[PDB]
Amino acid sequence: AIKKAHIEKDFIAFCSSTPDNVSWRHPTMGSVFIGRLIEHMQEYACSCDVEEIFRKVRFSFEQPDGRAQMPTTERVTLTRCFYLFPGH
């Protein structure tokens, strides 16, 4: 037998800035959003679901300097918490 499934579900997108706005990159240090994401993933993958981690990344950008940007979570259809369970 056939069964219905949602066409779009279990997605999460994480963008480097808000719509209309620039995202920064350093010639030797790389892109700050990327570097910030790795650091937070390394630290928090063990204890936080990815949505929580993405919020924490956002929080780290809260205080604006000369190179300001605000990463944005987009089009979320995660119905459950996505824990990476690193080591397992």
Binding site: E8, F11, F14, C15, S23, S31, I38
Partner: protein
Amino acid sequence: TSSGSEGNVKLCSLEEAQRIWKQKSAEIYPIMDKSSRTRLALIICNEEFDSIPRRTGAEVDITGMTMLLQNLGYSVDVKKNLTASDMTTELEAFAHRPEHKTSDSTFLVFMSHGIREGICGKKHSEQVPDILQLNAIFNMLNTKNCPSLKDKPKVIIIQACRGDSPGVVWFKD
């Protein structure tokens, strides 16, 4: 130690995993057996462009992201300097990978120049736009076009500008 497969990623202990499985009920995505699962990730990074400036430092991002996704247990495909058409072809090929059937999740990473409408391909200019829309990425990875990833978390990461604006306003304290 950082000498293991997980490198610099802090490990989740068995007691930690049971605490998470207790603080939240059946509201967590199921994880497949480590011995048998075939996790896949795709990084598309555009560094060298026909018209727009070279994305110097992209190598640091490629290295960092590739190693991180491997640390998290994903086999990482890295594709570089693609047009929007090439990106679509690669995404379609990724959606067709048989390993997704025996995987519990996926990560997609896009790194390029960007405008409001979307992500720039290598051939992009104002005269002849070469753009991949975020909408297209979702469509290609959804249940219709990627049934293998049904019910499985699909994480999309985009490093790119979304316009020309500095993203700031002034206020007085």
